[PDB]
Amino acid sequence: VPIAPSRGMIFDRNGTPLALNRTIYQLELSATLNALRPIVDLTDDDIANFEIAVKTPLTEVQVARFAVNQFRFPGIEVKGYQRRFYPYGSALTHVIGYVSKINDKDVERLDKEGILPNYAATHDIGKLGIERYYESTLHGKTGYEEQPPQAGKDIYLTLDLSLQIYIEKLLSGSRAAVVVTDPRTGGILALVSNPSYDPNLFVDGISNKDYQGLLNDTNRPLINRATQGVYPPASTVKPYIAVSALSAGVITKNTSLFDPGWWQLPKRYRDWKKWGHGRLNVTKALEESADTFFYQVAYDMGIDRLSSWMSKFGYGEYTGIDLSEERAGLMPTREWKQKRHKKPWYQGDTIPVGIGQGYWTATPIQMAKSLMTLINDGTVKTPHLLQSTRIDGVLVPYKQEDSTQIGSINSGYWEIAKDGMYGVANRPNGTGRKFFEGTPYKAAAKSGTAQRDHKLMVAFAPYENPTVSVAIILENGGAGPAVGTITRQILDHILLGD
Ligand SMILES: *C(=O)[C@@H](/N=C/N1CCCCCC1)[C@H]1N[C@@H](C(=O)O)C(C)(C)S1
C-alpha cells in the first residue's frame, strides 16, 4: 500500500519555516465504538460523522490513552497523518500560496501527466504560489508497505519574513502590491499583495461560503496584484524609455526641448506641470517626471521602435518569476492593435504609451524586473523567489539560465537614466525629494501616477552600489500613506538593519 511522502518545507532567506507539516493523529461490532468513548473521548458527533477514520483529530492525551488500551481493540491503530500549516498566514498567502484538497479535476490532470501513482496516498496539492510552481519538488517520491517514501525537497525562498510582514502592515486597507528585490541576484526580498486572506482556509478545504466571500470581495484579495495586476506603469517607464531613446540615438545626453506645459500632435497633451518645466534634457525630464519631454520622444521614436525596446526590458512579457499566477500585460504594437481591435494604429496611440499610459499595461513584477535590468546596466535578471533547494540534505542554490543583455553595459546611458532617478529623490527639482529627506544611504527613485489615480514608485539603493530595489503600487492611491512614504520606510528597514 502507498506511503504518502512528507511535503518539503518552505523557508524565508534565513531558514524561518513559512510552510510546515503538523501531525494530525487519527483512529482507524458497534459495541467497540461505545467502548472507545471513554478512551479517546469519542463524541456522538465523531460516530455520526464517521458513517476509515473513526475519530479525528486525536489529541496526544487521547492517543496515549488508546496506546495503553491497544490490546483491548483488535486491528484498530493510531495513524500520524500531516497537514500543511502556514504560521504567518495572510503575510505570504500570494508568494507561498497554499496546498488544498485534490478534487476529481486535479486527478484527471495528474492522470494524463502519468504521475497519479505518486499522489495515490496524497490528499492535498499545491494550488497557488510557491506551493503550486514547486509542487513537483515539494511533493517527493511515494513509498510502499517496506520501500520508504523519498520526502519532498525543502525550498529556501529569498523572501525576508521580517520585511514581508512589515510591508503587509504598511499596505493595510490599501489594494496594493510591493516587490522588493535584491537586484544583484534577482532574489525577491518581499512580494506583497493587499488585501490577502488566510492560506490555511484552503489546506483542510475551503467552504463555498468562504470562497464566494474571497471571490465576490470588491477588493479582490484572490488576485496576486504583484504578478497578476495589470496597471498603466505610467511614469515609472520613463528611465527605460530614456535609455531606449539614447541607444536608438533619437535623443542624446544633452537634448534641450522647451516645455510650455503642453505638447500638440504635429490634438494637445497636458504635462502634469500646468505651465511646463521649460528647457529639458532627459536628466531633468526624469528628475521632474516631465510628460511633454517623453510625449515628444514617443513621437520621434514611434510605436514600433519604442514597443521593441520595452519588450527588451520585458514589458508585455512573462518575467519568469517561479509562480504560475502571472500576467504579461501588454506592450502594444501596430501588429497587436490591428489583430486585437481590428483598427489600424493612430499617432494619438504612441503619445499615451510614451508616459507608460494608453494600451501599455504592466505587472509590479514586470516593473521590478525592468528596474533590476536598468540597475545592472542591461544585464537582465529573472525575479526568483527560490534561494536554494534541499537536495540530499545539501542546499543547491538558484542559478540563472537567462544570460540576456541589452545594448552595451559600458554605454553611459544607464548612468544618466539612473542619475535622473538619483535626482527624483536627492535633488530639489526631484519628484520624490520629499520622501528621501536625510537618507543615510543615497536612494534613486522614479514616481508615477496612472489614469482615483494609481500611485506608483520603483526605487533602489544604495545608488552608489545598489543591494535593494522596490516596485510599489497603491491601487487608486494609498489607503493613507503616500507610495513614496512606504518606499522610504521599506528602504529604511532593509538598509538601516543591514
Ligand atoms: C508619469 O506617469 C506622469 N504622468 C502622469 N499623468 C499625466 C499628468 C496628469 C496626472 C496623472 C497622469 C506622472 N508622474 C507623477 C509622479 O508621481 O511621479 C507626476 C505627478 C509627476 S505626473
Distance CA 313, CA 87 (A): 36
Find out whether the beta carbon of 199 lies less than 6 Å from any atom of ligand 1: no
Distance CA 171, CA 225 (A): 12
Distance CA 88, CA 64 (A): 30
Find out whether the beta carbon of 235 lies less than 6 Å from any atom of ligand 1: yes
Give yes or no for a contact between 25 and 63, defined as CB atoms under 8 angstroms apart. yes
- Residue-by-residue DSSP string for 97-128: -EEEEPPHHHHHHHHHHT-GGGGSS--EEEEE
Q: Which of 174, 193, 196, 235 is catalytic?
A: 235
Distance CA 199, CA 212 (A): 15
The interaxial angle of helices 413-426 and 364-375, nearest 10 deg, is 120
User: 166 lies in a domain?
Assistant: yes
User: 148 lies in a domain?
Assistant: no
User: 444 lies in a domain?
Assistant: yes
Residue 15 CA, ligand 1 centroid: distance in Å: 41
Instruction: Single out the residue of 118, 91, 116 nearest to residue 106, CA to CA.
Output: 116
Find out whether the beta carbon of 448 lies less than 6 Å from any atom of ligand 1: yes
CA atoms within a 13 Å half-sphere pointing along the CA-CB vector of 340: 10
Q: What stretch of H or E contains 2?
A: strand 2-3
User: 487 lies in a domain?
Assistant: yes
Distance CA 54, CA 487 (A): 54
Find out whether the beta carbon of 292 lies less than 6 Å from any atom of ligand 1: no
Do you find a cis peptide bond into 57, omega within 30 degrees of 0? yes
Residue ranges of E strands in 347-483:
386-391, 394-397, 444-450, 454-461, 468-474
Distance CA 324, CA 246 (A): 35
What is the residue range of 227's domain?
161-205+220-386+401-497
Find out whether the beta carbon of 366 lies less than 6 Å from any atom of ligand 1: no
What are the CA-CA distances from residue 198 to residues 57, 101, 210 (Å)?
Answer: 21, 16, 11
Residue 76 CA, ligand 1 centroid: distance in Å: 70
Number of H helices, E strands in the chain: 17, 18
- In the sheet where 468-474 sits, what is the strand order? 190-194, 176-180, 468-474, 454-461, 444-450
Distance CA 246, CA 95 (A): 36
Which residue in the block uniquely carries the three cell numbers 494530525? Answer: 24
Distance CA 246, CA 44 (A): 77
What are the CA-CA distances from residue 385 to residues 43, 130, 335, 347 (Å)?
Answer: 45, 8, 34, 40
Residue 450 CA, ligand 1 centroid: distance in Å: 7
Q: What stretch of H or E contains 56?
A: strand 55-58
User: 443 lies in a domain?
Assistant: yes
Alpha helices of 134-192 — where are they, by DSSP H? 135-139, 161-170
Distance CA 462, CA 439 (A): 10
What grid cell was written down for 214?
474571497
Number of domains in the chain: 1
Give yes or no for a contact between 219 and 292, defined as CB atoms under 8 angstroms apart. no
Give yes or no for a contact between 432 and 420, defined as CB atoms under 8 angstroms apart. no
Distance CA 468, CA 439 (A): 14
The CATH number for 320's domain is: 3.40.710.10
What are the CA-CA distances from residue 286 to residues 281, 389, 413, 414, 468 (Å)?
Answer: 9, 41, 13, 13, 21
**Atom 22, ligand 1: residue with shortest CA distance:** 272
Distance CA 498, CA 493 (A): 8
What grid cell was written down for 497?
538593519
- Method in brief: X-ray
User: 230 lies in a domain?
Assistant: yes
Residue 448 CA, ligand 1 centroid: distance in Å: 5
Q: With 0-12 CB in 10 A as exposed, 13-18 as middle and 19+ as buried, what is 246?
A: buried
For residue 188, what are the contacts with CB-CB under 8 A and spacing of at least 6? 95, 157, 158, 159, 179, 180, 181, 321, 368, 383, 384, 385
Do you find a cis peptide bond into 462, omega within 30 degrees of 0? yes
**Atom 9, ligand 1: residue with shortest CA distance:** 272
User: 292 lies in a domain?
Assistant: yes
What grid cell was written down for 309?
525596446
User: 319 lies in a domain?
Assistant: yes
289 belongs to the catalytic site: no
For residue 187, what are the contacts with CB-CB under 8 A and spacing of at least 6? 13, 158, 181, 384, 387, 398
Give yes or no for a contact between 250 and 297, defined as CB atoms under 8 angstroms apart. yes
Give 391's strand partners.
Answer: 394
Atom of ligand 1 nearest to the CA of 272: 8
Interrupted after residues, the chain (C–N over 2.5 Å): 28, 51, 145, 266, 451
Residue 51 DSSP SS3: coil
Cβ atoms within 10 Å, residue 138: 25
